[PDB]
Each structure stands twice: as C-alpha cells, then as structure tokens.
Ligand binder design. Sequence first.
Ligand SMILES: COC[C@H]1O[C@@H]2O[C@H]3[C@H](O)[C@@H](OC)[C@@H](O[C@H]4[C@H](O)[C@@H](O)[C@@H](O[C@H]5[C@H](O)[C@@H](O)[C@@H](O[C@H]6[C@H](OC)[C@@H](O)[C@@H](O[C@H]7[C@H](OC)[C@@H](OC)[C@@H](O[C@H]8[C@H](O)[C@@H](OC)[C@@H](O[C@H]1[C@H](O)[C@H]2OC)O[C@@H]8CO)O[C@@H]7CO)O[C@@H]6CO)O[C@@H]5CO)O[C@@H]4CO)O[C@@H]3CO
Ligand SMILES: [Cu+2]
Length: 56
Amino acid sequence: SHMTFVALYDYESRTETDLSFKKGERLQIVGDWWLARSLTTGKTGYIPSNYVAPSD
Ligand SMILES: COC[C@H]1O[C@@H]2O[C@H]3[C@H](O)[C@@H](OC)[C@@H](O[C@H]4[C@H](O)[C@@H](O)[C@@H](O[C@H]5[C@H](O)[C@@H](O)[C@@H](O[C@H]6[C@H](OC)[C@@H](O)[C@@H](O[C@H]7[C@H](OC)[C@@H](OC)[C@@H](O[C@H]8[C@H](O)[C@@H](OC)[C@@H](O[C@H]1[C@H](O)[C@H]2OC)O[C@@H]8CO)O[C@@H]7CO)O[C@@H]6CO)O[C@@H]5CO)O[C@@H]4CO)O[C@@H]3CO
Ligand SMILES: [Cu+2]
C-alpha cells in the first residue's frame, strides 16, 4: 500500500535511464534513485527519491 508516490516537483530526464515526470504525477516504486513506473505514461526508469512523497 506504501509504494505509490507523487511527484512534488517537475523533473526532466538527463540520461537514458532516468524518467521525466510532472508535479502531481504518480509513480509506483518497483538509495537516492529509485526504479519507478509512471502511472501516467507507464514508462519505467529511475527517479530521484527526494522529488517524490508517499501518495495513498
Ligand atoms: C484502445 O483501448 C483498448 C483498451 O481499453 C481499455 O484499456 C484502458 C485502460 O483500462 C485504462 O486504464 C485506466 C487506460 O489505460 C491507460 C493505462 O492504464 C496507463 O498505464 C497508460 O498506458 C500506457 C502504457 O502503460 C504504456 O505501456 C504505453 O502503452 C503502449 C504500448 O507500449 C507498451 C504499445 O505496445 C501499444 O500497445 C498496444 C498493445 O501492444 C502491447 C496491443 O496489444 C496487442 C494492443 O492492445 C490491445 C489490448 O491487447 C486489448 O486488451 C485485451 C484491448 O485493450 C483494452 C483494455 O482491455 C481496456 O481495459 C479496460 O485493446 C488494446 C488496443 O487494441 O494495442 C495497444 C495500443 O497500440 O500502444 C500503447 C499505447 O501507447 O503507453 C500507454 C499510454 O500512455 O495510459 C493508458 C491510457 O492511454 O485507458 C485504456 C484505453 O484507453
Ligand atoms: Cu505498500
């Protein structure tokens, strides 16, 4: 129940392995970088964990 998060800020991907997202986008979490799946786009990639907070 605790592995869904919401983006607190916009983030633009820098590399081939990170995931861009918009503030308010929800991310399912599959360290400082977490593997996540966007619940908007379905794309998977790494996100900065400090940019997201738990979402119920
Ligand atoms: C056309 O709609 C038919 C479909 O209707 C219902 O699905 C709803 C779904 O329930 C609803 O969910 C709340 C929403 O879906 C949204 C997703 O939840 C959300 O994650 C996101 O989706 C993302 C995906 O996560 C990404 O993976 C990506 O998807 C694209 C695929 O990349 C992996 C790409 O390959 C291509 O998908 C094809 C697919 O190839 C895998 C192909 O399968 C043979 C075919 O899909 C069929 C499907 O097999 C069949 O299911 C039995 C049926 O699906 C219906 C659902 O069952 C029904 O659920 C209640 O028909 C499909 C279409 O014919 O075709 C796929 C489309 O080409 O393309 C993917 C799209 O880009 O990116 C998406 C989008 O960001 O967003 C979703 C909404 O956009 O809506 C669904 C329908 O609107
Ligand atoms: Cu949980």
